[PDB]
Design an enzyme around this catalytic site. Structure first.
Site, mmCIF file in Angstrom:
data_model
loop_
_atom_site.group_PDB
_atom_site.id
_atom_site.type_symbol
_atom_site.label_atom_id
_atom_site.label_comp_id
_atom_site.label_asym_id
_atom_site.label_seq_id
_atom_site.Cartn_x
_atom_site.Cartn_y
_atom_site.Cartn_z
ATOM 1 N N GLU B 59 -1.681 -8.245 2.381
ATOM 2 C CA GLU B 59 -2.172 -7.489 1.244
ATOM 3 C C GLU B 59 -3.069 -8.354 0.361
ATOM 4 O O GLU B 59 -3.994 -7.855 -0.272
ATOM 5 C CB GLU B 59 -1.005 -6.924 0.441
ATOM 6 C CG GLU B 59 -0.208 -5.873 1.196
ATOM 7 C CD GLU B 59 0.803 -6.469 2.162
ATOM 8 O OE1 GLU B 59 1.042 -7.692 2.107
ATOM 9 O OE2 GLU B 59 1.374 -5.708 2.967
ATOM 10 N N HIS B 128 9.732 1.765 0.286
ATOM 11 C CA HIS B 128 9.103 2.942 0.862
ATOM 12 C C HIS B 128 9.201 4.073 -0.162
ATOM 13 O O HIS B 128 8.965 5.235 0.168
ATOM 14 C CB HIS B 128 9.829 3.356 2.142
ATOM 15 C CG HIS B 128 9.306 2.706 3.389
ATOM 16 N ND1 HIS B 128 8.836 1.409 3.420
ATOM 17 C CD2 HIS B 128 9.227 3.162 4.663
ATOM 18 C CE1 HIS B 128 8.491 1.095 4.655
ATOM 19 N NE2 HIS B 128 8.719 2.141 5.430
#
Lengths: 331, 323, 335, 323
Positions: B59, B128
């Site tokens: 990322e 998530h």
């Protein structure tokens, strides 16, 4: 004895016909060899069990590990379960099983029942055990690498003689934390062994960036995986620092001649350590173990709603006490 | 015609790429796969690996490289697989992206977009289901947008791509295919920084956005059965948020409940709430009430309860109404 | 082509000022003298910074004495105004040799309106749009991923440009340093990563990316120039990135607040002298010219005046949103 | 004895280390260097390298390793050179540290302390002035402490070291030696989660902490001269914060001004203010007024205008009193 570092071809010890290729004598007694095979079958069957659990809605997520048996079982046997620490990733349920974690706990976590010592706090494939030093899986890709380094440093300072093994996929080797964590362990000469379960510059070559030994191993060869990792563990244990071991495997399921089980079976067979009868006895014992494990896990019961406010801190502060009271109004 | 949020988002990307060669997509599995949620499906096949590129699983590399691309000449739309995974790239987001224009005296700019799925309502557990918008809003230099309808998804994503300021674009995953709404195939955009009046009312103001919209709207429906007219205001843009829309609604109703699934402490709704109190104390007939995610990590087992339920929102509305 | 991953740092200037390369020296006497001139200027800029700190005209400096060969070599191995540079706080020498006006460098050190970065950051954070000098950010390695990204952009847009990224030894411990370079390598991006290492080698880390790594004598302006140049050419022809380690010895302290026989200059002076490219009189003049340039740059920087207080609310976004307009109005009632 | 904050912190560390072999210090230049602010001076000499260890310059390695060490058996006190540099180690802080106890069902714990200098007013520009506390308070699982006096520095750091929960300890650098105060040599701790009354009053409540204490106490002093009795409450602990101390004070005075140098949007003071409006609307005589850092990156040139001034605080107090 010392294996060759940074080899172009992955290190192998098992021939495709059960022959021993090592440049040192096999020293695993027949019982331990059969034990390795036994665990690989158990891991394989556990994985197939997961497929059913997900298919029948029993669990919401699975991370297929069929094909990782040799690598995962090898790691479990190269360390001292309960003494050494393991920093696994979500695909290591086979390693967890071989390590000794009760099926009840692994399944309790998959179903989020009270049988889960992690209390159903996370999604499936996030087992964790205090009893077996199995650091609770975290979702991020490589966030568990720096912690593994830290644990190893603690082992060094406290002179416990322990080692910390850390596993991850190849995707993880792209993360900065992967690099930063291993770098710290290398600089400190920490007793940590970093292992890539690579579903195949190699990963082993990256070890050069830390000045530590890097190994490319056939992850479908349980003996090659066992011996190389074991050597790395011993190196760490004697205070010589970390190692990066790349175990190349092949995942059958989603994220034939290579299956590690048949390949090792032939090795046992060539030494009077295997036969169809024993094979069936073992499988039967395993399926019974699985059914018993699933049963215990299911009838454990759903986790209470209030548990949502437990363990954020050792004790619940004022705001959590107010939030728990609020939720109750709705229960 | 009617389409899901995924389809609208995909349309927006396709349209902007066809209109500007500089627009490029980058992220984990955005190409061949078309994204884990199919938002970028078919874009690789149509525009090539030079416009849609798969990247390593870093990322920091994605966000940071996107910043470099934007400063040099491209209009990158970077994807972070999950809102929860923005953290490994957080320094790039706040030290490089957010502060580029400011620290350079305007010499360098960052016309880039960082989109990510967020919020719970699907059983994401710890990484998530997160809603990290507060981290972005607290960081000067980043525009933050959270969509809740297919129409807005397309209109605002297109707007973000044309905006020169860096935009963090949040897409509630539970809403990816939860509804097929009418979305014009024709080119249109929506204004960043403007709230949307989902339902007009005069007895209560319901300030919300993204993930919680389903429960808030049904809550307003329940209140209607009892004769209470709740005004539902979807903020959409969290930074800069629609100050006027919020204050106009609150001044009118005199009572407000703010809803979100992000943790309570130092959250974005806390900011709006504190601002309503500081500026409209004289218009308040009841205390500004906040219905948010609890101050705990996102739980898997109690996922159903962490995300504000219709009941929880109604208990707060009732509390504000009876005050 | 120079040898990669060498045991001993690559060196081209001998102890007695003699040339040590296999190939014949192909830089004209004029270019050689220019390299030295720029080194002196960089050194004198650094020594002027010491004075600025002593009198408190600036609040922070990051001594770069000892980096002149590395920084000047880099400036000359690329195409200023065309290629991009992603520097770190210790590269003011590189900035100067690259062509950024002293007015702008000193303006940023003093935080006056002469600073194109508008006095937004503390000293040693130069940045120039005109010379593609990506404004410095304090974090040690945060500029590495951006460098990779710009290089990727150069590739996609076929601009033919190259992006060089400089950083110190500490930066190589950071995850973002690794992540950024790895992405550039995977993409085969035209970027050159250069370590100004105040001395596993850093060069060896290149094996982790599958790119070439070089160990160079950073106090040797010719070795630094030739190796970096080779890396740059490799990147420009689309062959991907390289990692170049320029071993240097920084003279001053890591940094300062308002409260030897390795010096690259004499070493290159000896090289020029042996070739009739240096004489005592030429250096007196050069130093006088430079001193005149410094005082003139400083004068212009100071006469530019202090940055207005309101500038604090500008450039956060292209245009100021309601909350910034409100906050600015609020502050005005205090001015 | 009379000592500066640095000395008080150094004493705390020395004491705890002498008391427990498990306590170790790690960070960049904490050893032979003694620290950029000398907080760890002399510790290496007295305890050795396997007790005070210099680390590679990686914030993720520092925080993450600290977490690993704490989980295994050590009680690490990690230092992040500047609060501004916590970001590269953000994922480790929020994904591993903050959630370890929670995600493991209590099987694993994180008895670690992360110390970091913070706050502006020291001409630190963008990365030597930040006050990131909001990011931490917003992350469930982290305790957050921000001290403003030598006495508190020692008492609370010793408390943190003994606390089994992860504690993020912010030390306003402008206050490192700003004053010499009486600090008992004897062993004593202070309660984490408890505010401290700096001044008793009944006309106005001044809620503050850390970096801004100088100007606040000064503003209070000037209000007294003018016949205004302001109550000054130094929160000290931001998470969990002293709910009762705050409400009791505001209930009494009916008017409150919250002060901090952290950016306004979604800040910690915004949280306290929103909570005051939500729980004590009936006790409010004036709107909760927030005096905070502006929503911009920390500016160098305007360093002293960004950091709240006594004038700024007085102007806010005036609006609260005159309301």
């Amino acid at each position: 004895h010392r294996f060759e570092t940074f080899t172009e071809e992955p290190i192998r010890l098992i021939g495709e016909e059960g022959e021993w290729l090592g440049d040192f004598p096999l020293d695993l007694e027949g019982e331990k060899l059969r034990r390795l095979y036994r665990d690989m079958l158990a891991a394989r069957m556990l994985d197939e069990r997961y497929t059913i659990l997900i298919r029948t809605g029993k669990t919401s997520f699975i991370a297929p590990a069929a094909g990782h048996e040799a690598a995962q079982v090898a790691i479990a046997h190269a360390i001292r379960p309960g003494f050494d620490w393991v920093f696994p990733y979500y695909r290591d349920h086979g390693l967890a099983l071989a390590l000794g974690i009760p099926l009840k706990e692994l399944l309790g976590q998959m179903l989020a029942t009270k049988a889960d010592p992690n209390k159903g706090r996370q999604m499936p494939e996030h087992p964790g055990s205090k009893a077996l030093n199995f650091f609770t899986v975290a979702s991020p890709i490589a966030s568990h690498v720096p912690p593994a380094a830290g644990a190893a440093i603690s082992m060094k300072l406290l002179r416990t003689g322990q080692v910390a093994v850390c596993t991850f996929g190849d995707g993880a080797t792209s993360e900065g934390d992967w690099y930063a964590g291993i770098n710290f362990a290398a600089v400190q000469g920490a007793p940590a062994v970093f292992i890539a379960e690579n579903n195949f510059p190699t990963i082993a070559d990256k070890a050069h960036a830390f000045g530590i030994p890097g190994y490319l191993v056939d992850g479908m060869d349980v003996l090659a995986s066992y011996y190389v990792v074991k050597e790395a563990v011993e190196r760490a244990r004697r205070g010589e620092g970390p190692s990066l071991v790349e175990l190349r495997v092949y995942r059958y399921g989603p994220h034939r001649k290579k299956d590690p089980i048949p390949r090792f079976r032939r090795f046992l067979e060539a030494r009077g350590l295997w036969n169809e009868e024993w094979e069936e006895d073992v499988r039967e014992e395993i399926r019974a173990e699985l059914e018993r494990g699933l049963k215990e896990a299911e009838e454990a019961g759903p986790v209470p709603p209030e548990w949502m406010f437990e363990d954020v801190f050792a004790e619940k502060p004022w705001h959590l006490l107010r939030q728990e009271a609020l939720l109750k109004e709705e229960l | 015609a009617l389409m899901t949020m995924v389809q609208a988002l995909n349309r927006a990307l396709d349209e902007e790429m066809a209109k500007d060669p500089r627009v490029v997509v980058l992220g984990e599995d955005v190409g061949k796969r078309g994204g884990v949620f199919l938002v970028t499906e078919g874009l690789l096949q149509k525009y090539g690996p030079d416009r849609v590129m798969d990247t390593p699983l870093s990322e920091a590399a994605i966000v940071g490289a996107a910043l470099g691309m934007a400063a040099h000449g491209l209009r990158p739309v970077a994807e972070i697989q999950f809102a929860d995974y923005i953290f490994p790239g957080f320094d790039q987001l706040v030290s490089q992206v957010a502060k580029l224009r400011y620290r350079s005296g305007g010499q360098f700019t960052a016309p880039l977009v960082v989109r990510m799925p967020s919020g719970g309502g699907v059983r994401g557990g710890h990484h998530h289901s997160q809603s990290p918008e507060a981290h972005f809003v607290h960081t000067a230099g980043l525009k933050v947008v959270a969509v809740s309808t297919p129409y807005d998804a397309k209109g605002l994503l297109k707007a973000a791509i044309r905006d020169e300021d860096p935009v963090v674009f949040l897409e509630p995953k539970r809403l990816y295919r939860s509804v097929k709404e009418e979305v014009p195939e024709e080119d249109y955009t929506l204004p960043i920084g403007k709230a949307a009046l989902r339902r007009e009312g005069k007895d209560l103001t319901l300030i919300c956005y993204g993930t919680v919209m389903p429960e808030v709207l049904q809550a307003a429906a329940e209140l209607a059965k009892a004769g209470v007219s709740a005004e539902v205001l979807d903020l959409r843009t969290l930074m800069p948020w629609d100050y006027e829309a919020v204050m106009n609604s609150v001044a009118k109703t005199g009572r407000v409940v703010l809803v979100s699934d992000a943790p309570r402490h130092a959250s974005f709704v806390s900011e709006v709430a504190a601002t309503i109190a500081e500026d409209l104390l004289d218009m308040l007939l009841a205390p500004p009430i906040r219905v948010t995610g609890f101050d705990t990590p996102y739980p898997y087992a109690q996922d159903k309860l962490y995300l504000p339920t219709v009941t929880r929102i109604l208990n707060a509305a009732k509390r504000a109404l009876d005050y």
